[PDB]
Paper text:
Here, a new method of on-chip crystallization is reported which allows the efficient and reproducible growth of large numbers of protein crystals directly on micro-patterned silicon chips for in-situ serial crystallography experiments. Crystals are grown by sitting-drop vapor diffusion and previously established crystallization conditions can be directly applied. As a consequence, ‘naked’ crystals are obtained on the chip, resulting in very low background scattering levels and making the crystals highly accessible for external manipulation such as the application of ligand solutions. Serial diffraction experiments carried out at cryogenic temperatures at a synchrotron and at room temperature at an X-ray free-electron laser yielded high-quality X-ray structures of the human membrane protein aquaporin 2 and two new ligand-bound structures of thermolysin and the human kinase DRAK2.
DRAK2 is a serine/threonine kinase that is involved in autoimmune diseases and cancer. Cluster analysis of the collected data with BLEND led to a 2.5 Å resolution data set merged from four individual crystals. The suitability of our on-chip crystallization system for on-chip ligand-binding studies is demonstrated by the structure solution of two protein–ligand complexes that are new to the Protein Data Bank: thermolysin in complex with aspartate and the human kinase DRAK2 in complex with Mg2+-ADP.
Author numbering: 18 to 190, 195 to 308
The structure:
Amino acid sequence: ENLYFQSMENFNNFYILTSKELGRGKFAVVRQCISKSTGQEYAAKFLKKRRRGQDCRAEILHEIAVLELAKSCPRVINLHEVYENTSEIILILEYAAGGEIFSLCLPELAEMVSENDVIRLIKQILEGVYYLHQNNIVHLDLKPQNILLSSIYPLGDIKIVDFGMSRKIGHACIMGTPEYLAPEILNYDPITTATDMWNIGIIAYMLLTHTSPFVGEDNQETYLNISQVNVDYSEETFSSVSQLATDFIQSLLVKNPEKRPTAEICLSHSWLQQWDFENLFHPEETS
Ligand SMILES: Nc1ncnc2c1ncn2[C@@H]1O[C@H](COP(=O)(O)OP(=O)(O)O)[C@@H](O)[C@H]1O
Ligand SMILES: [Cl-]
Ligand SMILES: [Mg+2]
């Protein structure tokens, strides 16, 4: 095997790793690093090339090409540099200092997220998904753990990460956290942009109620809830949620994918229409 990207010797010459570990999976690690020349902070993701007895270098290349195609979208994480060694490919990514949006879905921090904030974050997520779909890209893993924030105090902007499952529209299809799988995946139907819209419905549900819409006592119950779309819209859970927000969710969590609205249509939903009160509004009647 011959290596393609920059050598490991150059990496240790230009960067130094810090003690802040950001994430760890079974075939990947994310750790903060700093440039020796400028002092800027970055996030370095180490990806193993061999997995489950299979060579996956080609798949990593495909993921890099997707990041490159969306370089000009502010809602998608930026790729700075790439390095390679015997067993790993290393991605130098923009650093999101705010962490996962999943932190805002817990009953602990629920007291600091206003309606204006939720409206803004959803809007920004739709802007990134619309950009991807316009290029025939489907993320297929829009969990709250893969949607980050640039800042937390105050609240920053959205950054989407983790493109390991990206595909073109029409590719054939059953793994991942069961509670986030769309009904068409459990039925082995082809891939469609509507799948990402189903996941957007879950994000909004979790931000507004701080509960999971489909998780059950075990995996068997979770699958029944999904295939039957059994969701809790009770008084107790929605006492402080507006009707327009409820309408937004109920139009996305529908069994038939052909009935879900597109990203472009979602951006025109009445729940997201808001006027910045610091601007001078010009009515329809002139002087
Ligand atoms: N650019 C980043 N800035 C800050 N934290 C990050 C960044 N990228 C990933 N992380 C953190 O590392 C975790 C794992 O990253 P991810 O790309 O989702 O890899 P995996 O395939 O193991 O899920 C994320 O959940 C997030 O908390
Ligand atoms: Cl490491
Ligand atoms: Mg991930």
